[PDB]
Each structure stands twice: as structure tokens, then as C-alpha cells.
Design a protein around this nucleic acid. Sequence first.
DNA 1: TCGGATGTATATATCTGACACGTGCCTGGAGACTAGGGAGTAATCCCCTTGGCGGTTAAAACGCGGGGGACAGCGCGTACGTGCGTTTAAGCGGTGCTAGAGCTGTCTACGACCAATTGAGCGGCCTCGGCACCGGGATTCTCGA
DNA 2: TCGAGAATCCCGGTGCCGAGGCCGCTCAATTGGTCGTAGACAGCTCTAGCACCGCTTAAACGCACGTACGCGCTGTCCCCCGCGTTTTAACCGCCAAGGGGATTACTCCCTAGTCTCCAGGCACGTGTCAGATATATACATCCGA
Lengths: 98, 97, 78, 78, 94, 94, 109, 109
Amino acid sequence: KPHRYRPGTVALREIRRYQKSTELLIRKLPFQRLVREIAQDFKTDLRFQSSAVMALQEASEAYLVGLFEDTNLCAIHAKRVTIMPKDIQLARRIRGER
Amino acid sequence: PHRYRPGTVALREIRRYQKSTELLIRKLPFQRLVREIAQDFKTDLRFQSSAVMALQEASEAYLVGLFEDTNLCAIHAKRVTIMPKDIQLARRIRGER
Amino acid sequence: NIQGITKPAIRRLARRGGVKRISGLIYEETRGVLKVFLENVIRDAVTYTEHAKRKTVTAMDVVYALKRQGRTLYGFGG
Amino acid sequence: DNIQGITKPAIRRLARRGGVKRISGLIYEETRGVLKVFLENVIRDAVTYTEHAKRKTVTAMDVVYALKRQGRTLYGFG
Amino acid sequence: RSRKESYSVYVYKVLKQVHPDTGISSKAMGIMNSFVNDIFERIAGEASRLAHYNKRSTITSREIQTAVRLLLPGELAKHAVSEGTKAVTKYTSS
Amino acid sequence: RSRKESYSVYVYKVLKQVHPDTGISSKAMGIMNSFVNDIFERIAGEASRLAHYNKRSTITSREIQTAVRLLLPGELAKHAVSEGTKAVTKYTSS
Amino acid sequence: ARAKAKTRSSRAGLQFPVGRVHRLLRKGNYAERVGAGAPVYLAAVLEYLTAEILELAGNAARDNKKTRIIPRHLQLAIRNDEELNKLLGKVTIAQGGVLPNIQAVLLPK
Amino acid sequence: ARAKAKTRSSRAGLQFPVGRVHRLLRKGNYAERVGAGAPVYLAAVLEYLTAEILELAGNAARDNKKTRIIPRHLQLAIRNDEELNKLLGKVTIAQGGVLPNIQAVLLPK
DNA sequence: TCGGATGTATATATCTGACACGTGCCTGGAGACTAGGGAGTAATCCCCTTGGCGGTTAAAACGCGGGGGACAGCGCGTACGTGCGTTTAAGCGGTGCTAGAGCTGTCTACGACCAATTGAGCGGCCTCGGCACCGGGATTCTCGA
DNA sequence: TCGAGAATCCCGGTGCCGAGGCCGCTCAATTGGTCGTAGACAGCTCTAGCACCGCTTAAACGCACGTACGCGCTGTCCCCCGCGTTTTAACCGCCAAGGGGATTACTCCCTAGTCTCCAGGCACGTGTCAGATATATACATCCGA
């Protein structure tokens, strides 16, 4: 009979793995394409330095990680362990972004 | 006896107090509290009359906003009563703790 | 003197905030939070008063102290 | 259609660093919209700085100034 | 006895153009004064930072325009830019 | 070719005093440069506003001390004030 | 012979003062030198914002059968607009109050 | 006969530069004139804060068997304190990561 | 569904004090002139950004099975809302004293500015050891009978 | 409470590229005088902040009852997690072209600083009308039979 872990074990293993490293977690080329697509709506034929895209990606990852940290607190307050769109909405409303 | 049901007078008071603009705390106790807190930083201090008014206005506005956030947390928990844990969650998300 | 902030006053503030039912342990927490906020503002106000070499605290000092913490107040000079 | 380059595994890695144990299936579409709004806000200010400087290239300093203007100071790029 | 200055005259003159039959109280006048001073400080500080960034030593209408574009949201920015451009053009024309 | 300036030498001198056998990398050195610039700008702005409030035209050590007290929390402010006072006394002794 | 004086506001077609703005810019430690069109631009922008706020406040005051304007009217005008509430989102107006708002779940069945 | 030169930092007993800080204050449009002791005071404060942060970062670096200091060590030193964490609360550090933290409700029974 | 009870909106009359407006005056803004450097434009150089091509392979996408977590429902009990009778202290008015804020006039030390002079800090080279990677074995945590 | 399996930890060796030190040199910081104003100190005038006493009444306090809301326990089902297989595109290395960022001269128009002169805006005093306040309806909303 094959070996299987119970649900939740590998999730905690990944939490421990990623809370210890410091590397980026999104793909460079798709992120660059997205930045260049967004930039077209304000000016045409723009150029980007190499370090500008790195700075943008760093800021974006930090922002999303903080947002998820607050969403988890909302979900636990509701007596749950699964996060939800309403949790994200409540966190943003209290932070004042909406 | 003409008892109103629980919750009617509370809504009436909400409607009454969201329409006026006056202060809701007593001025002499607030002044005494301000002086007592101030005496720890320096002795023999005097206050202008408008300084205490500014302090009271800021305090009331801050408390009203905090209660507004607490209500949303309590509703999110599928309740209608507010508890200290709601205030704690609101302050933690706002970043004051 | 913190006990001079009464349960009816806290109830009025909560009604203006828009709440319907209040638990019995809210009042002590509210008093503590108010005390912390007042200490934080008054410390900076007294620092401004001391720098100008005065014995009186003024509305200008209170307004500056509020502005330093992202709580700008209109209606008292500036 | 470049917002689809941000994939479900990457969103899951970000959540795992945030400390989330279970995720529902409707989170990803919401996260994409949040990111789009944030990026639009920062990039518009960066382009405004570039246009005032009369350049055709966005630099790292423009991004740093744009982030600082929004209360999001960043270290290590200039 | 030293004398103070405010924007009360100009606020009243503006109000009499949009509502010729309305008055104002002292508290409202003070609030409007605070509003004007705060917006002035915001715009001036942003223009100063721009001049420092670009290694210039003069504050000009280009700096004011960029500061307005950075600070005001949406249609307010467009209308403010139009008003400023028209005023400068009229001033130069005379 | 223009040449630029930074605080790397002074940061290195400080490091060799508290840890005589530890090095540092370039990314960390850049982070330290950003830290020093940020704190400098904060304190200078606070002192400028104080001097403007008191209707003065000079920035002095008293203004710097008050700005430090307003900006730093708790024990950090006390230690910084002591360090600054000792440095000024030693400089004025010679 | 010297020609009759003519204020800068009159030749700019404005109601806010240009000379006072110029003086405040010069004595505010913002730069080493100040150009000639900057006060005109700044005055025009300030006047436009004042006019917008005053129009909204006057409408609010007339809605509830009053002749004068009070801080309650100013607060209502500011909070009911979408861009002004974004511009002044960290500002407290004394003697202003709050907007009427009750959540849907609290109303009686 | 001009006497031998002597730096102001040497007279103050400091490692950070005083003349450069004086020039930066003069050319930053902060005030009309600058006193003589202000650069000395400011340099002393900056040196103190740098020394504190570096001591903590070096302890963090030695804790994990390294000789050099890296952004991860800087982040750990800043976040594990209480006052530096409050002073640098709205700041993002590149290549720093986060503090290990798991909620107790999520742990297995 | 309806009558009884209670709270709230509306109209009329009467007072009162704050707003809107003249009036005198004084200082700050405008008109006219001069001088010097900040910035606008043209020309040149070389760096760094963009585009293409191929190979390897790690990550992404898809399908299946099952277990546990979300959610609706029911029941019990106690905590908070509402109303009434007694007590306490805030608000208002008026007297009275002096501490300290605000302004003015003298005078002197300190910061700005300019001209010689020299050493500290930056850019450009080299070079060796701290760390990154690989492979092998040891120990630990999880899961089912 | 124990065995089997998968994952993580420890350790010895190799190799390379980035931190760390040295050299020339040029520009910014130091030293020595001179000058004019900003700020420090004393003296005086008068605002306003503090302290007290009597009284009227509106708010606070305390108690009793009951109802509705919070919270625990059960059961169902469906959705999200873990794992194996196939597919796709990200990543690295290397070539090639040229757009544009950056620096150097040259010249001129715009802004700072002075001086004279006058009108805009501030302090102050005065009268009346908008709004506050009391009383009497009239009407809308809740609650139990």
C-alpha cells in the first residue's frame, strides 16, 4: 500500500520552509511583461532600467505578504482556518484602502 | 405598563445621536483628567481655555472612529454585541499594537 | 479621575459610532485606550511648550502635536 | 492578458510565507485585482517623475520616490 | 499692538460670486482658513522637493503644475491645471 | 567623469570598533547608507519647523536636541542626548 | 511721471492675492529664487478649490432651510463627495459630526 | 607661519564627518544660518544609532556561523528589538524575509 | 387588523446678540532701474537596453480519490436592556487677585564671506579565503497495525 | 506503543569570485581676518487664568424583572489537499545594433536688491435681523389582543 501523509502536514512543512528563506517567489519574465503592459496606458515607447523592475517586484511581494498576514487574523477571528474573499475585504476596509 | 421591546430605544438613540454635533463627555471631569495626566511631565503648569477644547474634540473623534471599526469586526463574527476582543483585533490591524 | 469618564458617556460615544448591544467589560478597556492616547499627545505638547520657555500650554502647541501624529485638526488656528 | 502570468502556485507560495494553512478557490482572482490596483498607483507617479525630468527611461530613483510618497519607504536601491 | 492677517476678505469675495444671498459664521471662516493654509503647504513642499531632485535652484510654474498633478486626484487635477494655465496666459498677455 | 560620495568609510570604521573581526557585504552597506540618509533628513526637517515656529532664523544644538527628543522613543533618546552633549562639551573644550 | 498702480491679481483676472503668495513663498525657505508665474498659478488653484467647496456647502445649507453656513454643512459637503473625501481623508472638522449610517443586519425584522 | 591643520571630528572625538554635515545643512534650504555646534550634535547622534544597529547585526551574524553581515541579519536584528522596530516600522528591507511565526490554533493536536 | 399610548414634526410668537458694514490710518506692495549668473541650446561620446537563437530541464497543468472542515439546526441558561425612585455634583452667575505673556530699547558676540593652502577620500587594480555546491551517511518525525 | 518510510541534518572536500587592501591625485575642507546684524537681557503694562461661594436642576446611580441572544453539540456533504503523469516555457549563454543618457562651451535674458510713493487691508464701533426657545397641536410608529 502506498504511503500518504494526512492533510495539513505538507502545508506546515512548506510554511516552515518559506518562512526561513529570503528569495523571490514570482517569475521574472511574466512580472516584467505585466509591468510593461500597465505602463503603456500612461505613455508610449518607454524604457526601463534593470533595477527599476527589481524594486517594483520587491515592493509588491512585501505588500502581498503583509496583506495575507492580516487576512489570516480575520479568518481565525471568525472561528475558521480557511481564508476567504470577505476576509481580505474586511482587512482592506479596516486598513483604509477602500 | 407600556414596555418597549429590547432594541427599540437603542435604535432611537442611534438616530438621535448621529444627527447632532455636541460633545458627549462632561467638561469638568475631562479637564481634571487632562491636568492629572499632564502633571507627570512638568509641575506648575497652566492651560489656555481653547487647548482643553481641542484635546476633547480630538479624543471624541478618535473614540467614535474606533467604535465604528469594532462594530464591523463584531458583525463579521456573526454577532450583534461588541467585546474586548473586537477592539483588540481592530487596533492590531490598524497598527497601534 | 479616569473614573470620571462614565458608563453613560461611553454609551453615548458608542451610539454615535452606531452599535446596538454593549457587553459589560467594554468600559475598562475604553478607559485604558483613552489614557494611552492622551498621554501620547500631551507629551509632545509639553515638549513644544518647554522649548519656547513658557509656563502655559496653548492651542497652537496642541495642534502641532496632533499634526505630528497624522491627526490634523481644523478649526483652532493654523 | 498578462495578469494570468501570476499563477496559483505563486499565490500559494506567497500565502505560505504569510502563514496561511488552508486556501479557498476564489482567492486568486481577488489577489490579482488587488495587485493590479497597487501597481497602477505606483507606476503612474513614477512616470510623472520621469516626464518632469524630461527623460525616456524610468530609473530606480523614480520608483523609490514614488514608493516614499505613498508611505512605503524602501531600502537598498538608492 | 501687532496685527494678524487671514484670507477672510477673499473667501467672502469668492462666496458672493457663487451664492449672492448666503452668509457665513466665524467658525466656518476659521475652518476655511485652515484648509487654505494646509493646501498651500502641501503644494509648496512638493515643488521644493522636485527642484532639489532635478538639481535646480528655482521654483517655476512647471514645478507647480507637476506638484498639482501629483497631489490632486482625478478631475480636480484637470480643472486646476486648466485654471492655472489660463491665468498665466492672461497675465502674460497684458 | 563625475565622482559620488557615501558613508561607507565611516560605517566601516564604526564596525571595526564594535566587532574587530566581522566584515560586511555590499548590499548591507547600501542598506546602511539609506538608513543614515533617512534619519538625517527626518531630524533636519523637524529642526527647520521648530525654528520657523519660534520666529527665528538660526538652527542650533537646542533645536537639534528638541528634534531628537520628539523623534526617538524611550531610552534611545536619553542615550543620544547624552552622547551629543558630551561631544559638544569636548569640542568646545579645545 | 509714474503711471497709476495696478495690482497683479487684477491683471491675472483673479480674486486671491498674488503679492502675499509671492512673499510667503520667498520667506518660507522653499528654494533660493522664485519665478514670476508661480504665485499666479498657486493663487488660481487655491481659488478654484475654495469655490468648489463653497458651492457644495451652500447647496447643503439651503437644503435644510438656512441662510448661513456652519461646520455641519461643510462636513456634509466634504463627506458626500468622492474626490474631496479622498483629498481630506485624514482631517477632523470641529463641530462637524458624522454621516447617518446603520448596518442592514441591525434593523428590526 | 600657518599652524598644522586639524579636523573638527578629531576635536570632537568622533568618527563621522562634521564638515560634510555642515555643508549639507547649509545647502539643504533648512534655515537662513547654521550654528557651530549643530553639526557636531547631529554627527554624534548618527554615530550612536549606527553603532547600536551594527552591534546587534554582528551578534545575529555570529549566531548562525558566519563572518560577514547580510540583509537577513540586519532584518533579524531590527525586528527582534522593540525600540528600533518602532523607529523603523514603515520600512521595507530588500532581501530580508520575515520572522518565523505560526499561530497556535493551526498546530496539530 | 386595529385601538391605545407615546414620541416627533410643524406652526406661531417673542427676544437677543453676532454679523455685516462704515471709518481712519499705516505699512507693505508697485513702479523704475541696475547687474550678474542660472539655465537653455548645440555638439559629441560611449554605455546599457532591446531583440534574436538554441538547448536543458524544472515548474506548471491536469486528473483522481477521500477525509475533514464548513454550515445548518436545536436546545438551554444567564447577561444585558428597559423603567422607576433616590442622590449627587455639574453649570451658571458674579467677585477678586496676581502670574506671566507681550512689547520695546541697547549692545555685543557670532556667523557669513573671501583668499591661500594642503591632505583626505574616490576611482582604478589585483589577489586570496569565505562561502556555495556535491555526495554520503545519520538521526528524527510521521503513520498504521 | 513499536517498525517502515520519507525528510531533514551533519560533514568532508573542491573551486571560484567578491571583499579588502594599496596608489595616484584633485577638489573640498581648514586657517586667518573683517563686518554687520540677530539675539540676549532688562524694564514695564495689562490680559487672562485661577480660586471661591450659593443655588437650581438635570444627570448619575442603584435595583428588579424578563427575554432574547450567545454558545455548546450533532449530523451531512462537498470541496480542497496530496500524489502521479504529461506538457510548456522559463532560464542561461552568446551576438549585434543603436537609442539615448551624460558632459562641455557659449551666451543672454530673467531675477535680486534699492528707493520712493501711495492705496489695500486691519482694528474698532454700531444697528438690526436671523435664529434660538417656549407652547400647542397634528400625525406617525409601536404593541398586544
